[PDB]
């Protein structure tokens, strides 16, 4: 299992250097089942709220992208009700060069702003450009009302 | 010993001095050392009903008929309505012998004290009233009872009906689901004030374990659905929905999502459970060490499956929930081996104020230093006279003796002393003859059978005052009147319903 | 349904607390006296104690302290009532107008909490930083004194020691500190805690745990430079300051118990003390000065000064004058003298203040046959016992004549034919080493013109003579015959050993024309929970001779007795019995009624019998002449602790509860089922604030002839433990509604001291229920309507329709209401 | 000897509620829990 051999080593560096606003950890000794704790990056409209992320590392890893699912209900411009985010880095475009450490920052940075070029819900895009005000106050409320 | 033990001294001293301000309450309470139930009657005949309890004000007595479908309301006539019959009888006992006189009173004693007023039938769809379920409102105007009806084996209930959340429990074979209903009945008239229904749950009506009333706020814990329903009791005795705690913490949570995402179908964890997860996370963040980080994620799965088991209201807006393993809550495993997490939650603000492990010494310090606030008994009297580890020195001493006895297991001691918590609503009686300040005895006899007669010793002098025996010269239940000198001792053997009345007789 | 009117005829006279300080101004010296609900302000001046202003509050004053925080020219007064209406008062005088301003006010009750046995305790930090309060066991309420903040956030503090007896604020400490004495299974201990306001807990004090005399019941905080505290017990006095410890056990102190104290010297060198027997002591704090300027305490000294009225509170005023406040006896104003008199007493009485209470029994009689009743009371206790002949009018309104007895009276009745008063009493004698008993002082019984002793052997030696330990007080009861003119003790019959006389009647029985004195007793033994024996003795007083006409043995204590249509009605423990006077001059049982817990009080009207129980409230009975037995007509199911009962009318029955509450039961005329007719409904509720001890039909005012249409019907007097004498009457529904409407209007005009709501003051309140007043009118409030300014009167009468007696209501006018109140105010 | 020289205040001795007291609404046990909670935010 290439995934287990590679990830074992990557645990020492990541735990020694927990990136800001993005952290995680293993479950027991297994690698195919992990959890992560993500914190709303400072200045984000979801800032403050803490989101638990379901992260699964497949044995086929790294030839397939990591499995990501949100276990916290978040109104995001990239994620649907099932908590799955589909970004090229999390798709076939994935490459073995990227590691479990980078994804958090890519996800963490992605939370700050939408990618309306390929959005998963069109209502935001109209609200995102026309009147973002409705999209923020309510976005503030959701994190304030759920993640708090 | 003060020479004031006689009633006369107390009566004369009361006519010249009312005492220091605020002491007059204890001026009268000492009379209970002069007036007590010194006389006992064995094996009194009674209707084929099930006796339940007195009302907090001690005016009404409730019993359940043998069909567990109607509530019997009896009015207490006083502990002085059977003195005419007993004239000429001496001693501390009255054997159920053969003399016609004793038979005449035994067949007449029960009706002398208790007068039938109403018999209200509430269950109408196969439901059966729970014998151990009973609650009285703060004003004492209304009583609350619950009826349960086992569901049929087939057809099996719908999956979307039996399971309404990701954290729902899996029903066990021995205790299949039931359809519950709660009724509020006015004691004065017997009218059925209002009734609410619950479908496909598992609520422990017995001993009010799944229920708790604080003033006018009522809480119901649905173990099957891991959901809490909160109702407000109006003066009329009509239920009003307050809010529901569970998958959502705010009453408007469903409304907002419905418009955006109209929708077991949702993998997001419960709003409440998320807050408990946040607290265990933020606390683990303070340590910073890899160990604390190591443990948090290692047991995340085990912790995420924790399920509610009990609850109780610390105030009108705080809940003291207890959490335990999914297996234990279904009565398959012993809890002590499983860590139980106590949680304090604010209903309006919606944050977890505190979380205490089972071995949390901080919680134990709170319990013994605030046992009065946890018990929340005798709430129906503005001037309460609580007896507990935090209200009487002698009550505290027993608490230390139990703990010291176990140590001479520190951890195991903490384990069992918290087994009673959370407490069941309206489980304690404000009987002055049970007050430790006035009288002395061993709390073990009344809260396996105690073969010895219970003896009550006055604390001022240490002298015996009266004895209580609940058998014919094996479960024993006592029911003291809230204040007056009257007590019922019921001895159960197989199917025998033995009743003895303890009342004050002026030995002539 | 029931409409009653309650008024006060004699304001309470007992003294609960006394404090002195600078209140009216920074230069004046003020004496403040609390008499239950009345606050009196006196100025210590050359001519005496000049009255300044007497203020009545809507509560039972339970705490009264004076303090002066920084930035205040004169001191401020803090008062807490028994209903927990805390307030802070300021004295303002504008010209001739004198006003009391409530700087702060608010209630501090905790709905959950066990009231402490020793009662309410109030303490103030010497620096005026906080206010402590010990209301409920296990809690110590605090009130920070932030001048700038508008919400004084009182907060409770957990207190580990549950049974706290006394607590005080120490002197000369950087942070607020409290010293207190508490009880526990190991005995009694004294401990200290430091109060930290911000953290809101107790911090370890500068002292250590200690074990002291089990009777330690009072703590005195010695001011600078001594510091420390003084602990007073039953047989010792000790001083604690850090490690410094002193002890004295003078034999003089043990003869009584110290119950009060007061500081004379600001340095704390000299301390006053009073005890139960009335003896006044002086505690001296001798100081040894070091060469380094450190003041160290040398030793204590206790020196008897003399005797005074049994003291409840002492307050040294100035120039050697001390004020002694007493509940059981008259309050004195004594002078301490440099040189003792021939008797070795330095105490000289200067003035005495009348104190009727505690009224224990009374009878309304017409000595002059002029229609003016002269109330005769059994006042006082112990050496202060006396008879007060309260006569209304002048010939201010109340004229009181005192007849000291030097022993506690218990009962009284008037026998017109013999022209004498029959009075019970009980002096105290100590068991001398000789085997008998010796009276402590000469009293009325020992100074009787003629004496007799009961000679009966109804009670054999079956009861063993218990340990007659030397020095143990014993009560000896006597029946005194007192002339109605000179009030001499014509005769004094003594009762058997350990026999207590509880009831007394003077009536004719049956066809017999002779009048008699009937006494019900009870053989009392200390170790017996209840009396199992008693007697009913019939005495006859003729030509100055007392004859024991007949006796009677009963199986209990004769709590009460009353003549019932030529037959004797007596209550024995839980029984109510009826006796007949046979031609052989003996008592014969007729009928019984055993359905009571304790039949303490009996009253009758016609064939109806009103029975007051110890805890089961009122019960109505009737006599069946044709059947000769009792029919229990109705009863009350509300468990009140009774202390007096009376029958206002055939339908209304009045009672008094232990918690200073009145209530009126009524017979259910709307009941259809036989069960519903067996319930007595409560139509009246009222918080009086006094422990009523007796009711007696009568009136001190001349009985108006021909005025049967007066606004009020009936008249019932009642005496309280505090010396209050009040009058109760029934009212027509039209008048009750008129005054009830007027009552609410007044509360919007008159500002109550402490901003306490009147409705809250009079609200029925017990341990079980708390309800607003119903069917009662506060006469005191109505009478105050006269003393307010005219424009204030006009405000009440606004938009109010009044009936001028023609059956219709017209626009009301103030002058019209003046006449209504004037009739009401003249009925007492 | 001990009664001499008693205090003398005068030789002629005898010849708009600016504040409100409000008890804390929260029960004492809760206050302990709340106050302990606020320390976590500071820590």
Coordinates of N, CA and C in Angstrom, one line a residue, chain C residues 49-177:
Chain C
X49 N -34.8 63.0 76.5 CA -34.8 62.4 75.2 C -35.9 63.1 74.4
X50 N -35.5 64.2 73.7 CA -36.5 64.9 73.0 C -37.0 64.1 71.8
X51 N -38.3 63.8 71.6 CA -38.8 63.2 70.4 C -38.6 64.1 69.2
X52 N -38.3 63.5 68.1 CA -38.1 64.3 66.8 C -39.1 63.9 65.8
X53 N -39.1 62.6 65.4 CA -40.1 62.1 64.5 C -40.3 60.6 64.7
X54 N -41.6 60.1 64.7 CA -41.9 58.7 64.9 C -42.4 58.3 63.5
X55 N -41.8 57.3 62.9 CA -42.1 56.8 61.6 C -42.5 55.3 61.7
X56 N -43.6 54.9 61.1 CA -44.0 53.6 61.0 C -43.8 53.0 59.6
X57 N -43.2 51.8 59.6 CA -42.8 51.2 58.3 C -43.7 50.0 58.0
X58 N -43.8 49.7 56.7 CA -44.5 48.5 56.3 C -43.7 47.3 56.4
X59 N -43.3 46.9 57.6 CA -42.6 45.7 57.8 C -42.2 45.6 59.3
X60 N -41.7 44.4 59.6 CA -41.2 44.2 61.0 C -39.7 44.4 61.0
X61 N -39.3 45.5 61.5 CA -37.9 45.9 61.5 C -37.1 44.7 62.2
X62 N -36.1 44.1 61.4 CA -35.3 43.0 61.9 C -33.8 43.4 62.0
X63 N -33.4 44.4 61.3 CA -32.0 44.9 61.3 C -32.0 46.4 61.3
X64 N -31.2 47.0 62.1 CA -31.1 48.5 62.1 C -29.7 48.8 62.5
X65 N -28.9 49.4 61.5 CA -27.5 49.8 61.8 C -27.3 51.2 61.2
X66 N -26.4 51.9 61.7 CA -26.1 53.3 61.2 C -24.6 53.2 60.7
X67 N -24.4 53.9 59.6 CA -23.1 53.9 59.0 C -23.0 55.2 58.2
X68 N -21.7 55.6 58.0 CA -21.4 56.9 57.3 C -20.3 56.6 56.3
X69 N -20.7 56.4 55.0 CA -19.7 56.2 54.0 C -19.0 57.6 53.6
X70 N -17.8 57.4 52.9 CA -17.1 58.6 52.6 C -17.9 59.5 51.7
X71 N -17.7 60.8 51.9 CA -18.5 61.8 51.2 C -19.9 62.2 51.8
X72 N -20.2 61.6 53.0 CA -21.5 61.8 53.7 C -21.2 62.7 54.9
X73 N -22.0 63.7 55.0 CA -21.8 64.6 56.2 C -22.3 63.9 57.5
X74 N -23.5 63.2 57.4 CA -24.1 62.5 58.5 C -24.4 61.1 58.1
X75 N -24.6 60.2 59.1 CA -24.8 58.8 58.9 C -26.0 58.5 58.2
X76 N -26.1 57.3 57.6 CA -27.2 56.7 56.9 C -27.7 55.5 57.7
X77 N -29.0 55.2 57.6 CA -29.7 54.1 58.3 C -30.1 53.0 57.3
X78 N -29.7 51.8 57.6 CA -30.0 50.6 56.8 C -31.0 49.7 57.6
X79 N -32.2 49.4 57.1 CA -33.2 48.7 57.7 C -33.6 47.5 56.8
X80 N -33.7 46.3 57.5 CA -34.2 45.1 56.8 C -35.3 44.6 57.6
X81 N -36.5 44.3 56.9 CA -37.7 43.8 57.5 C -37.7 42.3 57.4
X82 N -38.6 41.7 58.2 CA -38.8 40.3 58.3 C -39.2 39.7 57.0
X83 N -39.8 40.5 56.1 CA -40.1 40.1 54.7 C -39.0 40.5 53.8
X84 N -37.9 40.9 54.2 CA -36.7 41.1 53.4 C -36.8 42.3 52.5
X85 N -37.4 43.4 53.0 CA -37.4 44.6 52.3 C -36.3 45.5 52.7
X86 N -35.1 45.2 52.2 CA -33.9 46.0 52.5 C -34.1 47.4 52.0
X87 N -33.5 48.4 52.7 CA -33.5 49.8 52.3 C -32.4 50.5 53.0
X88 N -32.1 51.7 52.5 CA -31.1 52.6 53.0 C -31.7 54.0 53.1
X89 N -31.8 54.5 54.3 CA -32.6 55.8 54.6 C -31.6 56.9 54.9
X90 N -32.1 58.1 54.5 CA -31.4 59.4 54.8 C -32.3 60.4 55.4
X91 N -31.8 61.1 56.4 CA -32.7 62.1 57.1 C -32.5 63.5 56.5
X92 N -33.6 64.1 56.1 CA -33.5 65.4 55.6 C -34.6 66.3 56.3
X93 N -34.2 67.5 56.7 CA -35.0 68.5 57.3 C -35.0 69.7 56.4
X94 N -36.2 70.1 55.9 CA -36.4 71.3 55.1 C -37.3 72.2 55.9
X95 N -36.7 73.2 56.5 CA -37.5 74.1 57.4 C -38.2 73.3 58.5
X96 N -39.4 73.5 58.7 CA -40.2 72.7 59.7 C -40.6 71.4 59.3
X97 N -40.4 71.1 58.0 CA -40.8 69.8 57.4 C -39.6 68.8 57.6
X98 N -39.9 67.6 58.1 CA -38.9 66.6 58.3 C -39.3 65.4 57.4
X99 N -38.3 65.0 56.6 CA -38.6 63.9 55.7 C -37.5 62.8 55.8
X100 N -37.9 61.6 55.4 CA -36.9 60.5 55.4 C -36.9 60.1 53.9
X101 N -35.7 60.0 53.3 CA -35.5 59.8 51.9 C -34.8 58.4 51.8
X102 N -35.4 57.6 50.9 CA -34.9 56.2 50.6 C -33.8 56.3 49.5
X103 N -32.6 56.3 49.9 CA -31.5 56.3 49.0 C -31.5 55.1 48.1
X104 N -31.6 53.9 48.7 CA -31.7 52.6 48.0 C -32.8 51.8 48.6
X105 N -33.3 50.9 47.8 CA -34.4 50.0 48.2 C -34.4 48.8 47.2
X106 N -34.9 47.7 47.8 CA -35.0 46.5 47.0 C -35.2 45.3 47.9
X107 N -35.8 44.2 47.4 CA -36.0 43.0 48.2 C -34.9 42.0 47.9
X108 N -34.5 41.3 48.9 CA -33.3 40.4 48.8 C -33.7 38.9 49.3
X109 N -35.0 38.6 49.1 CA -35.4 37.2 49.4 C -34.8 36.2 48.4
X110 N -34.5 35.0 48.8 CA -34.1 33.9 47.9 C -35.3 32.9 48.0
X111 N -35.9 32.6 46.9 CA -37.0 31.7 46.8 C -36.6 30.3 47.4
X112 N -35.3 30.0 47.3 CA -34.8 28.7 47.9 C -33.8 29.1 49.0
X113 N -34.0 28.5 50.1 CA -33.1 28.7 51.2 C -33.8 28.4 52.6
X114 N -33.0 27.7 53.5 CA -33.5 27.4 54.8 C -33.2 28.5 55.7
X115 N -34.2 29.2 56.3 CA -34.0 30.3 57.2 C -33.1 29.8 58.4
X116 N -32.2 30.6 58.9 CA -31.3 30.2 60.0 C -32.1 30.2 61.3
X117 N -31.7 29.3 62.2 CA -32.4 29.2 63.4 C -32.2 30.4 64.3
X118 N -31.1 31.0 64.3 CA -30.8 32.2 65.1 C -31.3 33.5 64.6
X119 N -31.9 33.4 63.4 CA -32.6 34.6 62.8 C -31.8 35.4 61.9
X120 N -32.3 36.6 61.6 CA -31.7 37.5 60.7 C -30.5 38.2 61.4
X121 N -29.4 38.3 60.8 CA -28.2 39.0 61.3 C -27.7 40.0 60.3
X122 N -27.5 41.2 60.7 CA -27.0 42.3 59.8 C -25.7 42.9 60.3
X123 N -24.7 43.1 59.4 CA -23.4 43.6 59.8 C -23.0 44.5 58.7
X124 N -22.2 45.6 59.1 CA -21.7 46.5 58.2 C -20.2 46.7 58.4
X125 N -19.4 46.7 57.3 CA -18.0 46.9 57.4 C -17.7 48.2 58.0
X126 N -16.7 48.3 59.0 CA -16.4 49.6 59.6 C -16.0 50.7 58.6
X127 N -15.4 50.3 57.4 CA -15.1 51.3 56.4 C -16.3 51.6 55.5
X128 N -17.5 51.0 55.8 CA -18.7 51.3 55.0 C -18.4 50.8 53.5
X129 N -17.9 49.6 53.3 CA -17.6 49.1 52.0 C -18.6 48.1 51.6
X130 N -19.3 47.3 52.5 CA -20.2 46.3 52.1 C -21.2 46.1 53.3
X131 N -22.2 45.3 53.0 CA -23.2 44.9 54.0 C -23.4 43.4 53.9
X132 N -23.1 42.8 55.0 CA -23.4 41.3 55.1 C -24.8 41.1 55.6
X133 N -25.3 39.9 55.3 CA -26.6 39.4 55.8 C -26.6 37.9 55.9
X134 N -27.0 37.4 57.0 CA -27.2 36.0 57.3 C -28.6 35.7 57.4
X135 N -29.3 35.4 56.2 CA -30.7 35.1 56.2 C -31.0 33.6 56.2
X136 N -30.3 32.9 55.2 CA -30.6 31.5 55.0 C -29.3 30.7 55.3
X137 N -29.5 29.5 55.8 CA -28.4 28.6 56.1 C -27.5 28.4 54.9
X138 N -26.2 28.4 55.1 CA -25.2 28.1 54.1 C -24.9 29.3 53.1
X139 N -25.6 30.4 53.2 CA -25.3 31.5 52.4 C -25.1 32.8 53.2
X140 N -24.3 33.7 52.6 CA -23.9 35.0 53.2 C -24.1 36.1 52.2
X141 N -25.3 36.7 52.1 CA -25.5 37.7 51.1 C -24.6 38.9 51.4
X142 N -24.2 39.6 50.3 CA -23.4 40.7 50.4 C -24.0 41.8 49.5
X143 N -23.8 43.1 49.9 CA -24.3 44.2 49.1 C -23.2 45.3 49.0
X144 N -22.4 45.3 47.9 CA -21.4 46.3 47.7 C -22.1 47.7 47.7
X145 N -21.3 48.7 48.1 CA -21.9 50.1 48.3 C -21.3 51.1 47.3
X146 N -21.2 50.7 46.0 CA -20.8 51.5 44.9 C -21.6 52.8 44.9
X147 N -21.1 53.9 45.2 CA -21.8 55.2 45.2 C -22.3 55.5 43.8
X148 N -21.4 55.4 42.8 CA -21.7 55.9 41.5 C -22.6 54.9 40.8
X149 N -22.5 53.6 40.9 CA -23.3 52.7 40.2 C -24.8 52.8 40.7
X150 N -25.7 52.5 39.8 CA -27.1 52.6 40.0 C -27.8 51.3 40.4
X151 N -27.2 50.2 40.2 CA -27.7 48.9 40.5 C -26.8 48.2 41.5
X152 N -27.2 48.2 42.8 CA -26.4 47.6 43.8 C -26.6 46.1 43.7
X153 N -25.7 45.4 43.1 CA -25.8 44.0 42.7 C -25.5 43.1 43.9
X154 N -26.5 42.8 44.7 CA -26.3 41.9 45.8 C -26.1 40.5 45.3
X155 N -25.1 39.8 45.9 CA -24.8 38.4 45.5 C -24.5 37.6 46.7
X156 N -25.0 36.3 46.7 CA -24.8 35.4 47.8 C -23.4 34.7 47.6
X157 N -22.8 34.3 48.7 CA -21.5 33.6 48.8 C -21.7 32.3 49.5
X158 N -21.2 31.2 49.0 CA -21.3 29.9 49.6 C -20.5 30.0 50.9
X159 N -21.1 29.4 52.0 CA -20.5 29.4 53.3 C -20.5 27.9 53.8
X160 N -19.3 27.4 54.0 CA -19.2 26.0 54.3 C -19.8 25.6 55.7
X161 N -19.7 26.5 56.6 CA -20.3 26.3 58.0 C -21.7 26.6 57.9
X162 N -22.6 25.6 58.2 CA -24.0 25.7 58.0 C -24.7 26.4 59.2
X163 N -24.3 25.9 60.4 CA -24.9 26.4 61.7 C -24.1 27.5 62.3
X164 N -24.3 28.7 61.8 CA -23.7 29.9 62.3 C -24.5 30.6 63.3
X165 N -24.0 31.0 64.4 CA -24.7 31.5 65.5 C -24.6 33.1 65.5
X166 N -23.4 33.6 65.5 CA -23.2 35.0 65.5 C -22.0 35.3 64.5
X167 N -22.1 36.4 63.8 CA -21.0 36.9 62.9 C -20.9 38.4 63.1
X168 N -19.6 38.8 63.0 CA -19.3 40.2 63.1 C -18.2 40.6 62.1
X169 N -18.1 41.9 61.8 CA -17.1 42.5 61.0 C -16.0 43.0 61.9
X170 N -14.8 42.5 61.7 CA -13.6 42.9 62.6 C -13.2 44.3 62.3
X171 N -12.4 44.8 63.2 CA -11.8 46.2 63.1 C -10.4 46.1 62.7
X172 N -9.9 47.2 62.2 CA -8.5 47.4 61.9 C -7.9 46.3 60.9
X173 N -8.6 46.0 59.9 CA -8.2 45.0 58.9 C -8.2 45.7 57.5
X174 N -7.1 45.4 56.7 CA -7.0 46.1 55.4 C -8.1 45.7 54.5
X175 N -8.5 44.4 54.4 CA -9.6 43.9 53.7 C -10.7 43.5 54.6
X176 N -12.0 43.7 54.1 CA -13.1 43.3 55.0 C -12.9 41.9 55.5
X177 N -13.2 41.7 56.8 CA -13.0 40.4 57.5 C -14.1 40.2 58.4

